[PDB]
Amino acid sequence: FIVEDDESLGHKELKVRKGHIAKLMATEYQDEYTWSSLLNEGLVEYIDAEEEESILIAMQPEDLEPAEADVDPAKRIRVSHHATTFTHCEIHPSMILGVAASIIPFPDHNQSPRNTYQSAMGKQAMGVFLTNYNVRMDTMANILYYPQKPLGTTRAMEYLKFRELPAGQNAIVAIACYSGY
Amino acid sequence: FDMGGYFIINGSEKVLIAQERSAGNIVQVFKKAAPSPISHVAEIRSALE
Amino acid sequence: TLSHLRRTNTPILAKPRQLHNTHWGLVCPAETPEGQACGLVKNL
């Protein structure tokens, strides 16, 4: 996002605003205000690593822009602002995962080689692969007789079309030794 | 729910991997080691794209 | 299939197998198969 202070509220603020989001909500209801219109509006900025050499992002715009003129004990710790001059803003940092690695429910707690093992394994998950399966003539398709959407719904599954086409099941799990197996 | 991004070569769904390399036409300088008379070496790849 | 489409190759105890800080937001910071292709083949 682009967070130049182009409004007289005092300190620095966003340029994207809720009315643009509401016009986007009308565009949801169409399913005239596209992401190309968001570009030509001058709200989102295509940035590479070379332009990332000389910027200073803010992560959460509902946290990192204003100053503090009470806290949840069971929550994580956000650090500070040791700056004021933030120029751009992260959309949601939950986009930096990949295709397979964002299917993880709650990667906020792992030990990251386990996530790497998830990215290795989750490729090999088997169930629905496509929709034209009785029509195609391909080798080694593995249809699950009873697909199931997961219980964990990360919103990346929605645009990822995972919650519309899954490839596994739930079950009930307990964690205790039972008969030495 | 197919979105494409793939060819068909003789019925095979072959898929091109995005390859990855470093161009020249940018400043490149090194620190070359002991088996050399060079202490630092500059470089371009003068490759006409 | 989608992760197979957004996958990246590279030809050649060294630095390029690492997860460099420039990959932040671009490369998936937690995907690479095991074996000798560890550290190099990446995903967006």
């Binding site: 966003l14 605003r17 009315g19 992401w35 822009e65 | - | 489409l5």
Partner: peptide
Amino acid sequence: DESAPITAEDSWAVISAFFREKGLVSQQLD
């Protein structure tokens, strides 16, 4: 007021319009 400072949940709609504008083989099609 249309000029509100936002939450992150707006950005999910931003990504929604983004992806259902393009798709996911965007660099292949480009």
